[PDB]
Scaffold this motif. Structure first.
Motif, PDB file in Angstrom:
ATOM      1  N   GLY A   2       0.804  -1.204   0.000  1.00 15.69           N
ATOM      2  CA  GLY A   2       0.000   0.000   0.000  1.00 15.69           C
ATOM      3  C   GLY A   2       0.838   1.255   0.000  1.00 15.69           C
ATOM      4  N   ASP A   3       2.023   1.191   0.596  1.00 10.95           N
ATOM      5  CA  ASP A   3       2.889   2.355   0.633  1.00 10.95           C
ATOM      6  C   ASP A   3       3.434   2.675  -0.743  1.00 10.95           C
ATOM      7  OD1 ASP A   3       2.661   2.861   3.415  1.00 10.95           O
ATOM      8  OD2 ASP A   3       4.110   1.265   3.828  1.00 10.95           O
ATOM      9  N   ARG A   4       3.323   1.739  -1.677  1.00  7.89           N
ATOM     10  CA  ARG A   4       3.722   1.965  -3.054  1.00  7.89           C
ATOM     11  C   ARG A   4       2.534   2.311  -3.936  1.00  7.89           C
ATOM     12  NH1 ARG A   4       8.647  -2.013  -4.956  1.00  7.89           N
ATOM     13  NH2 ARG A   4      10.086  -1.484  -3.251  1.00  7.89           N
ATOM     14  N   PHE A   5       1.445   1.564  -3.793  1.00 11.89           N
ATOM     15  CA  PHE A   5       0.246   1.795  -4.582  1.00 11.89           C
ATOM     16  C   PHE A   5      -0.148   3.262  -4.568  1.00 11.89           C
ATOM     17  CE2 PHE A   5      -2.952  -0.173  -6.913  1.00 11.89           C
ATOM     18  CZ  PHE A   5      -4.137   0.430  -6.654  1.00 11.89           C
ATOM     19  N   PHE A   6      -0.471   3.775  -3.392  1.00  5.92           N
ATOM     20  CA  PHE A   6      -0.985   5.124  -3.261  1.00  5.92           C
ATOM     21  C   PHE A   6       0.102   6.180  -3.227  1.00  5.92           C
ATOM     22  CE2 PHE A   6      -4.329   2.488  -1.597  1.00  5.92           C
ATOM     23  CZ  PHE A   6      -5.452   3.061  -2.110  1.00  5.92           C
ATOM     24  N   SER A   7       1.370   5.788  -3.284  1.00  2.00           N
ATOM     25  CA  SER A   7       2.439   6.776  -3.300  1.00  2.00           C
ATOM     26  C   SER A   7       2.772   7.185  -4.719  1.00  2.00           C
ATOM     27  CB  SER A   7       3.674   6.227  -2.602  1.00  2.00           C
ATOM     28  OG  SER A   7       4.219   5.142  -3.327  1.00  2.00           O
ATOM     29  N   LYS A   8       2.649   6.258  -5.651  1.00  2.94           N
ATOM     30  CA  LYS A   8       2.835   6.527  -7.060  1.00  2.94           C
ATOM     31  C   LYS A   8       1.508   6.380  -7.787  1.00  2.94           C
ATOM     32  CE  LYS A   8       7.450   4.665  -6.716  1.00  2.94           C
ATOM     33  NZ  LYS A   8       8.328   3.511  -7.042  1.00  2.94           N
ATOM     34  N   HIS A   9       1.329   7.223  -8.787  1.00  2.30           N
ATOM     35  CA  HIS A   9       0.041   7.387  -9.426  1.00  2.30           C
ATOM     36  C   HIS A   9      -0.480   6.075 -10.002  1.00  2.30           C
ATOM     37  CE1 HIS A   9       0.670  11.691  -8.969  1.00  2.30           C
ATOM     38  NE2 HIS A   9       1.908  11.471  -9.372  1.00  2.30           N
ATOM     39  N   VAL A  10      -1.771   5.838  -9.772  1.00  3.97           N
ATOM     40  CA  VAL A  10      -2.482   4.636 -10.178  1.00  3.97           C
ATOM     41  C   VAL A  10      -3.411   4.984 -11.330  1.00  3.97           C
ATOM     42  CG1 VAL A  10      -3.794   2.681  -9.337  1.00  3.97           C
ATOM     43  CG2 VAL A  10      -2.425   4.008  -7.748  1.00  3.97           C
ATOM     44  N   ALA A  11      -3.691   3.999 -12.181  1.00  6.93           N
ATOM     45  CA  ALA A  11      -4.516   4.200 -13.361  1.00  6.93           C
ATOM     46  C   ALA A  11      -5.382   2.985 -13.634  1.00  6.93           C
ATOM     47  CB  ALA A  11      -3.650   4.491 -14.578  1.00  6.93           C
ATOM     48  N   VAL A  12      -6.644   3.231 -13.966  1.00  5.96           N
ATOM     49  CA  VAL A  12      -7.595   2.197 -14.343  1.00  5.96           C
ATOM     50  C   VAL A  12      -8.092   2.493 -15.746  1.00  5.96           C
ATOM     51  CG1 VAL A  12      -9.545   0.856 -13.584  1.00  5.96           C
ATOM     52  CG2 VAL A  12      -8.271   2.186 -11.980  1.00  5.96           C
ATOM     53  N   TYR A  72       1.828   6.648   2.657  1.00  2.00           N
ATOM     54  CA  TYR A  72       0.419   7.007   2.612  1.00  2.00           C
ATOM     55  C   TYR A  72      -0.425   6.153   3.548  1.00  2.00           C
ATOM     56  CZ  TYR A  72       1.182  10.168  -1.286  1.00  2.00           C
ATOM     57  OH  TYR A  72       1.600  11.215  -2.074  1.00  2.00           O
ATOM     58  N   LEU A  73      -0.236   4.837   3.518  1.00  2.00           N
ATOM     59  CA  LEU A  73      -1.103   3.973   4.307  1.00  2.00           C
ATOM     60  C   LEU A  73      -0.715   3.971   5.775  1.00  2.00           C
ATOM     61  CD1 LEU A  73      -3.608   2.373   3.970  1.00  2.00           C
ATOM     62  CD2 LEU A  73      -2.264   0.417   3.211  1.00  2.00           C
ATOM     63  N   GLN A  74       0.546   4.268   6.082  1.00  2.00           N
ATOM     64  CA  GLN A  74       0.942   4.413   7.476  1.00  2.00           C
ATOM     65  C   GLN A  74       0.367   5.691   8.064  1.00  2.00           C
ATOM     66  OE1 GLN A  74       5.180   4.108   7.992  1.00  2.00           O
ATOM     67  NE2 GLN A  74       5.064   1.924   8.501  1.00  2.00           N
ATOM     68  N   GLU A  75       0.445   6.788   7.315  1.00  2.00           N
ATOM     69  CA  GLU A  75      -0.151   8.036   7.764  1.00  2.00           C
ATOM     70  C   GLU A  75      -1.668   7.978   7.733  1.00  2.00           C
ATOM     71  OE1 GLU A  75       2.178  10.739   9.103  1.00  2.00           O
ATOM     72  OE2 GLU A  75       2.670   8.600   9.089  1.00  2.00           O
ATOM     73  N   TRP A  76      -2.241   7.005   7.031  1.00  2.00           N
ATOM     74  CA  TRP A  76      -3.683   6.835   6.981  1.00  2.00           C
ATOM     75  C   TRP A  76      -4.195   5.903   8.061  1.00  2.00           C
ATOM     76  CZ3 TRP A  76      -5.239   6.236   1.074  1.00  2.00           C
ATOM     77  CH2 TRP A  76      -5.465   7.508   0.545  1.00  2.00           C
ATOM     78  N   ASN A  77      -3.363   5.575   9.045  1.00  2.00           N
ATOM     79  CA  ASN A  77      -3.782   4.773  10.186  1.00  2.00           C
ATOM     80  C   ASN A  77      -3.434   5.442  11.511  1.00  2.00           C
ATOM     81  OD1 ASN A  77      -4.403   3.058   8.093  1.00  2.00           O
ATOM     82  ND2 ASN A  77      -3.663   1.224   9.150  1.00  2.00           N
ATOM     83  N   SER A  78      -3.237   6.755  11.502  1.00  2.00           N
ATOM     84  CA  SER A  78      -3.116   7.540  12.718  1.00  2.00           C
ATOM     85  C   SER A  78      -4.389   8.347  12.948  1.00  2.00           C
ATOM     86  CB  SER A  78      -1.906   8.469  12.642  1.00  2.00           C
ATOM     87  OG  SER A  78      -1.945   9.435  13.678  1.00  2.00           O
ATOM     88  N   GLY A  79      -4.453   9.001  14.101  1.00  2.00           N
ATOM     89  CA  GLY A  79      -5.595   9.828  14.411  1.00  2.00           C
ATOM     90  C   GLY A  79      -5.594  11.132  13.639  1.00  2.00           C
ATOM     91  N   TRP A  80      -6.784  11.705  13.492  1.00  2.00           N
ATOM     92  CA  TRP A  80      -6.922  12.973  12.803  1.00  2.00           C
ATOM     93  C   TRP A  80      -6.001  14.013  13.418  1.00  2.00           C
ATOM     94  CZ3 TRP A  80     -10.906  13.967   9.004  1.00  2.00           C
ATOM     95  CH2 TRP A  80     -10.884  15.276   8.517  1.00  2.00           C
ATOM     96  N   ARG A  81      -5.242  14.687  12.565  1.00  2.00           N
ATOM     97  CA  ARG A  81      -4.263  15.677  12.981  1.00  2.00           C
ATOM     98  C   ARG A  81      -4.809  17.084  12.785  1.00  2.00           C
ATOM     99  NH1 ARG A  81       0.795  14.121  12.830  1.00  2.00           N
ATOM    100  NH2 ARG A  81       1.435  11.940  12.531  1.00  2.00           N
ATOM    101  N   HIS A  82      -4.312  18.002  13.606  1.00  2.00           N
ATOM    102  CA  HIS A  82      -4.765  19.384  13.612  1.00  2.00           C
ATOM    103  C   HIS A  82      -3.746  20.249  12.888  1.00  2.00           C
ATOM    104  CE1 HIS A  82      -5.271  23.508  15.075  1.00  2.00           C
ATOM    105  NE2 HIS A  82      -6.541  23.197  15.262  1.00  2.00           N
ATOM    106  N   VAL A  83      -4.230  21.119  12.010  1.00  2.00           N
ATOM    107  CA  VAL A  83      -3.381  21.954  11.174  1.00  2.00           C
ATOM    108  C   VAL A  83      -3.677  23.410  11.487  1.00  2.00           C
ATOM    109  CG1 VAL A  83      -2.472  22.266   8.883  1.00  2.00           C
ATOM    110  CG2 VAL A  83      -3.645  20.159   9.466  1.00  2.00           C
ATOM    111  N   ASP A  84      -2.680  24.120  12.003  1.00  2.00           N
ATOM    112  CA  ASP A  84      -2.842  25.542  12.260  1.00  2.00           C
ATOM    113  C   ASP A  84      -2.871  26.290  10.947  1.00  2.00           C
ATOM    114  OD1 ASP A  84      -2.559  28.053  14.140  1.00  2.00           O
ATOM    115  OD2 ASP A  84      -1.042  28.282  12.571  1.00  2.00           O
ATOM    116  N   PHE A  85      -4.066  26.478  10.397  1.00  2.00           N
ATOM    117  CA  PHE A  85      -4.154  27.132   9.097  1.00  2.00           C
ATOM    118  C   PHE A  85      -3.482  28.486   9.130  1.00  2.00           C
ATOM    119  CE2 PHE A  85      -8.042  24.743   7.227  1.00  2.00           C
ATOM    120  CZ  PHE A  85      -7.267  23.588   7.187  1.00  2.00           C
TER     121      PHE A  85
END
Ligand SMILES: Nc1ncnc2c1ncn2[C@@H]1O[C@H](COP(=O)(O)OP(=O)(O)OP(O)(O)=S)[C@@H](O)[C@H]1O
Ligand SMILES: Nc1ncnc2c1ncn2[C@@H]1O[C@H](COP(=O)(O)OP(=O)(O)OP(O)(O)=S)[C@@H](O)[C@H]1O
Ligand SMILES: [Mg+2]
Ligand SMILES: [Mg+2]
Lengths: 432, 113, 62, 62, 62
Positions: free
Chosen positions: A33-43, B91-104
């Protein structure tokens, strides 16, 4: 089976369950998954091969919604997607019962808040000025001067403001300003080298009076007593005002020229933040945002998409860099799903489309570093741009009929593996 | 005594004059067929199959062509210590943490320029 | 490995080390660094192939 | 409509298209007053003859 | 009373009109594939047995 399972389970970290293998139905399949969504995917898939259902399964597995039972009810995790849907197809793949406690953001033409003071140069030069594509060197410059000197009036605290800068700027004021410049008549007399109003009270700073109300200028003549000579730019603009008042009164685009707040008011230079939150789902704390583009016309969609893409990119860039200052990597990733791409990304198309191709094209070259990725779904590749589908690094091929389109997939596959590129025209429904 | 070395994401998106006069080529992973044609052409015939590997070269492999080497070849490069900031977001590691707060306030002001 | 590296390098005068040879991670690859660094060189690659890193390595070793 | 009735390769195409639009939008109201939010593309009835008359009057006016 | 002598390392790029009238040919090692075909077409009296030697020529053979 156990061994072929463990092989995928323990060798690869950060897995993403996808589906069953065609050799054996029971086994489960997983990928990095760290590769799939890190580099652009196409269908890419023909009609009836069900591209959208597959995309929806992917996204569901990504956000956790399985078996109509949200697993992450008590605590919420991180996942950020933005779907461009032309025909409201995906608006229901994520609609769970209230018990699941799922907050979804669903936007449309009627409720979209995208003003004009957030458009860069080329966009305005396309939307407001329409003449002799590049033969308007006078009007262009004066327009720019008007906007630049008006922005400082309504946000006086800020410093070194430029044209391309995103702050409030009223268009009606600019129209009336030019309509005033039109009928200018300078009161040419000793120490009277500036404009003269009906009451003979001269003016020193045009930016103080033209912006607010129309004025009735005095007459011109060469008589030595009341010598008043005509203005520089008179007559030049007799028509731009009448061409604009039309556009600015079109109702179909009233969502861009006359924005309103929930309490029926106009936005200020401090509301900018909110305008972004929604496009990223931070207002309603909705991991997903789903745009609808059906009701929109054909003539403004090309810019309405570009602007959204640009906003997302700017946010991501600046946040990723302010984080890099410390050294850590970004933590607010975003996935942009582009459906029915073949409508607003032709291979051979006129400038009527170009404003879009640039924006998206950026993400295809230099987006990875900053935290944005794409997912294109198209029915016919050779129609989609070449740059975009030249960089993508993961192809999901469903059924495809013609041979000219096969080449793109049949290439990526190497020699000894070859032999599968012939299965394409027999793929049953749902396979990949 | 002045010399050049240019790096591009794809070759076709560069002037045809520069590349024409560029002796040695260092070719990394490439997927499209058009870009593949250019690189395949330049290679000799005695050893030409090496082009079949381009579509699936790993993260670091390179094929070399020109005069400097005794004969075209493939190779790995070990990472450079230190590295230039180009890291890829996980991406998937950062997509398994809690919602983060961003000081806009910060992001917006910096945007303000 | 010894004789191979000898045959590879000894002939050239001024060598430049580049990296490992995929067919054998043990050996070290060397190239004529005069025809290189003198005639114009170029790099092309997709996103995620390691262009900038390799350029940095070449520079650092140079 | 922009096609069947108009040319686009002239010096002054923009400044006539951008007025034919307004002409149709207006002519659509008079003969369909009850409604509102009328737009160029909305199907209601209108007369092209009146359009010609209007664009003819707009040329000679002093 | 004027004769030429052309020397190029990649004849495929050089015009076709010139090489045609050229009569006597001297050939050394050739590597690329495209140039081989053209040179095999223009060379008049190349018995198939000889041509295969072009890319295996040693240093100096002609
Ligand atoms: N795993 C599956 N099980 C059962 N039915 C399936 C499965 N996969 C696909 N289908 C069927 O395939 C059809 C899906 O077609 P769609 O997803 O609408 O095609 P599409 O991808 O929308 O094509 P367009 O026009 O490009 S959006 C449905 O009728 C499903 O019943
Ligand atoms: N020898 C290696 N072994 C393992 N990983 C590597 C190696 N070399 C590079 N990488 C990885 O490659 C990534 C960097 O790739 P880059 O060289 O930045 O791509 P790029 O050429 O910069 O593409 P851009 O965005 O167009 S500049 C890093 O995250 C490294 O982890
Ligand atoms: Mg669909
Ligand atoms: Mg780089």
């Amino acid at each position: 089976p156990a061994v072929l399972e463990g092989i995928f389970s323990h060798q690869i970290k950060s897995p993403f369950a996808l589906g069953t293998l065609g050799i054996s139905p029971d086994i489960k399949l997983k990928i990095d998954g760290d590769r799939f969504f890190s580099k652009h995917v196409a269908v890419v898939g023909s009609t009836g091969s069900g591209k959208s259902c597959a995309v929806a399964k992917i996204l569901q597995t990504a956000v956790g919604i399985e078996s109509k039972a949200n697993a992450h009810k008590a605590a919420q995790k991180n996942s950020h997607i933005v779907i461009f849907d032309i025909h409201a197809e995906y608006a229901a793949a994520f609609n769970l019962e209230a018990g699941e406690a799922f907050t979804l953001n669903l936007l449309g033409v009627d409720n979209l808040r995208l003003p004009y003071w957030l458009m860069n140069a080329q966009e305005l030069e396309q939307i407001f000025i329409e003449s002799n594509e590049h033969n308007s060197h006078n009007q262009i410059s004066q327009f720019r001067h008007a906007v630049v000197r008006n922005k400082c009036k309504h946000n006086p605290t800020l410093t070194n403001l430029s044209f391309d800068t995103p702050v409030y700027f009223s268009i009606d004021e600019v129209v009336t300003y030019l309509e005033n410049m039109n009928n200018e008549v300078i009161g040419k007399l000793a120490g009277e080298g500036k404009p003269k109003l009906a009451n003979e009270t001269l003016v020193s700073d045009r930016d103080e009076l033209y912006f607010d109300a129309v004025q009735s200028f005095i007459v011109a003549s060469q008589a030595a007593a009341t010598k008043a000579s005509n203005g520089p730019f008179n007559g030049e603009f007799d028509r731009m005002i009448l061409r604009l008042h039309t556009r600015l009164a079109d109702p179909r685009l009233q969502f861009l020229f006359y924005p309103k707040k929930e309490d029926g008011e106009d936005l200020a230079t401090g509301d900018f933040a909110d305008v972004v939150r929604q496009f990223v789902g931070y207002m309603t704390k909705s991991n997903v945002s789903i745009i609808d583009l059906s009701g929109i016309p054909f003539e403004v969609l090309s810019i309405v998409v570009s602007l959204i893409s640009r906003m997302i990119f700017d946010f991501g860039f600046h946040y990723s860099k302010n984080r890099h200052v410390g050294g850590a990597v970004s933590d607010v990733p975003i996935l942009v799903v582009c459906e029915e791409a073949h409508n607003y990304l032709p291979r051979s198309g006129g400038a009527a489309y170009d404003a879009s191709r640039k924006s998206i094209e950026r993400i295809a070259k230099e987006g990875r570093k900053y935290g944005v990725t794409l997912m294109v779904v198209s029915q016919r590749p050779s129609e989609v741009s070449e740059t975009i589908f030249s960089q993508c690094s993961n192809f999901i091929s469903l059924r495809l009929t013609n041979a000219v389109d096969q080449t793109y997939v049949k290439s990526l596959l190497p020699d000894l593996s070859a032999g599968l590129g012939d299965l394409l025209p027999n793929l049953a429904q749902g396979e990949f | 005594g002045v010399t050049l070395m240019v790096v591009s994401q794809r070759p076709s998106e560069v002037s045809e004059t520069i590349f024409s006069q560029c002796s040695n080529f260092i070719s990394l992973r490439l997927t499209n067929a058009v870009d593949q044609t250019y690189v395949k052409s330049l290679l000799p015939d005695l050893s030409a199959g090496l082009g079949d590997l381009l579509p699936n070269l790993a993260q670091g492999e390179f094929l070399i062509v020109g005069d400097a080497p005794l004969m075209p070849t493939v190779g790995h490069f070990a990472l450079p210590v230190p590295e230039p900031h180009s890291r890829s977001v996980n991406y998937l590691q950062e997509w398994n943490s809690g919602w983060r707060h961003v000081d806009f306030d910060s992001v917006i002001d910096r945007w303000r320029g």
